[PDB]
Amino acid sequence: MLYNVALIKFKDIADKYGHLTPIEGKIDIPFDIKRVYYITKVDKDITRGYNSHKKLHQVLICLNGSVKIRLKIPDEEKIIELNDPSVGLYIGPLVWREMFDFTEGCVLLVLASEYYDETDYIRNYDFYIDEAKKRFLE
């Protein structure tokens, strides 16, 4: 079963004026926000990701529409659909992830614990498996 992943619940401050959700570094999520990014205008048949990370922590949030996140570690896979702006998906080190079924108008926001650093990525699936079997298997 799926280590290094959680669903985080944010305040959804909602009235006749609309919805607002705040996320304060170290309060609403466990790390300081050094970097954000967001993904938009993804075509319906596209899959993104295909990677893990050595040390990075992130929280993914779908702020409009819906998107599916495939989460993999050795011998376990989960799909999580993100479709509620008040819910974040925390993904820590050594989880492999893929994102797909981006709806029209979909907005995927990620909060990240470190500046962009390509050396922290694991893009090679066989190296990922070797590393992750060390961590997760006994």
Ligand X SMILES: Cc1cn([C@H]2C[C@H](O)[C@@H](COP(=O)(O)OP(=O)(O)O[C@H]3O[C@H](C)C(=O)[C@H](O)[C@H]3O)O2)c(=O)[nH]c1=O
Binding site for ligand X (CB under 6 A): 13, 20, 22, 35, 37, 39, 48-49, 51, 58, 60, 97, 99, 110, 116
* Residue recorded with tokens 């990370």: 53
Residues 6+ apart with CB under 8 A from 38: 63, 107, 108, 109, 110
Interacting span for a copy of itself (CB under 8 A) from 18-26, 68-76, 89-97, 120-128? 18-26
CB atoms < 10 A from the CB of 78, how many?
13
| Closer Cβ to ligand 4TD, 38 or 125, answer by number | 125
Instruction: Determine, following the binding rule CB under 6 A, whether residue 127 of this chain makes contact with ligand 4TD.
Output: no
Residues 6+ apart with CB under 8 A from 51: 96, 97, 121, 122, 123, 128
Binding partner of residue 57 among ligand X, a copy of itself, ligand 4TD, none, CB cut-off 5 to 8 Å per kind: none
Tokens of 8: 């985080």
Residues 6+ apart with CB under 8 A from 6: 89, 90
Determine which residue in the list 4, 51, 64, 83 makes contact with a copy of itself, applying CB under 8 A: 64
Tokens of 60: 């993914």
Rule CB under 8 A: which residues touch a copy of itself?
A: 14, 16-25, 27, 32-43, 46, 48, 63-65, 85, 102, 105, 107, 109, 111, 115-116
Rule CB under 6 A: which residues touch ligand 4TD?
A: 50, 125
